C-alpha cells in the first residue's frame, strides 16, 4: 500500500 | 459497557504488538497508528465533531497536537502532547495538556490528565488492539467533556479565538 511518509502527509494535510 | 464498546467499535483495532524500540515491527505499528488516526478524524469530520489533530516526530516517539471544545458557541483550543512509553502498547501514553496545569484537580504534575477508573483496566485487557485513536476517544475526549465545562463555569479559562 502506502509508506509511513505518505501516511504522515495524509494526517497532516487533513 | 455503555461507555465502552459504544465508542470503540467505530475505531479499527490495531494488530502489531511493538513499541518504539522494535525497529522494523515499530514501523509497522506506527503505520497502523496513522491509519487508525486518519480513519477516526474522518469519522469525526463526517459527524461534524472534528475535535483534535495530532502529529509526531519522524520516529513516532513524540506526539503533539491540539484539541477543540465548543461550549455556548465559544470555541476553545488547547495544546496537547505525550511521549510513547518503551513498553507501549502495553503501557498507555500519558497525555498532557500543559496550559491547564494548576487549574484542575483531575491532573498530575506537568499537566498530565487523570483518567476515569474505566480506562487503565480497559486498556490493559485489550493489548494490543487499542492505539492512539482509542487513547483520544476514551481518554482525552471524556476527560475534556467533564473538565472543560467545569473550568469555563469557574471563570478560569482564557477564550482566545472568536467563533
Numbering used by the authors:
A (entry chain FFF): 170 to 183
B (entry chain AAA): 3 to 165
In the authors' words:
Analogous to ubiquitination, ufmylation is carried out by a three-enzyme cascade involving E1, E2, and E3 proteins. The E1 UBA5 has three distinct regions: (1) an adenylation domain that binds ATP and magnesium ions; (2) a UFM1-interacting sequence (UIS) spanning amino acids 334 to 346 that holds UFM1 in a trans binding mechanism; and (3) a UFC1-binding sequence (UBS) from 392 to 404 that binds UFC117–21. The adenylated UFM1 is then subjected to a nucleophilic attack by the catalytic C250 of UBA5 to form a thioester bond with the C-terminal glycine of UFM1. This is followed by a trans thiolation process, whereby the UFM1 is transferred to the E2 UFC1 forming a thioester bond with C116 of UFC1. However, UBA5 does not harbor such a domain but instead has a short sequence called UBS that is responsible for the interaction with UFC128.
Here we report the crystal structure of UFC1 in complex with the UBS of UBA5. This structure reveals that the UBS adopts a helical conformation that interacts with UFC1, mainly via hydrophobic interactions. The UBS forms an α-helix and interacts with UFC1 on the side opposite to the active site surface. The UBS residues L394, L397, M398, M401, and M404 form hydrophobic interactions with residues V29, L32, L39, I40, V43 of α-helix 1 and F54 and L56 of β-strand 1 of UFC1. More specifically, M401 occupies a hydrophobic pocket on the UFC1 surface. Accordingly, M401R and L397R mutations in the UBS prevented the interaction with UFC1 and damaged UFM1 transfer. Besides hydrophobic interactions, the main chain carboxyl oxygen atoms of M404 forms hydrogen bonds with the side chains of UFC1 K47 and R55. In addition, K400 and K402 of the UBS form salt bridges with E44 and E57 of UFC1, respectively. However, mutations of these residues did not affect UFM1 transfer, suggesting that the binding of UBS to UFC1 is mainly mediated by hydrophobic interactions. UFC1 possesses a pocket, lacking in other E2 enzymes, in which the UBS fits spatially.
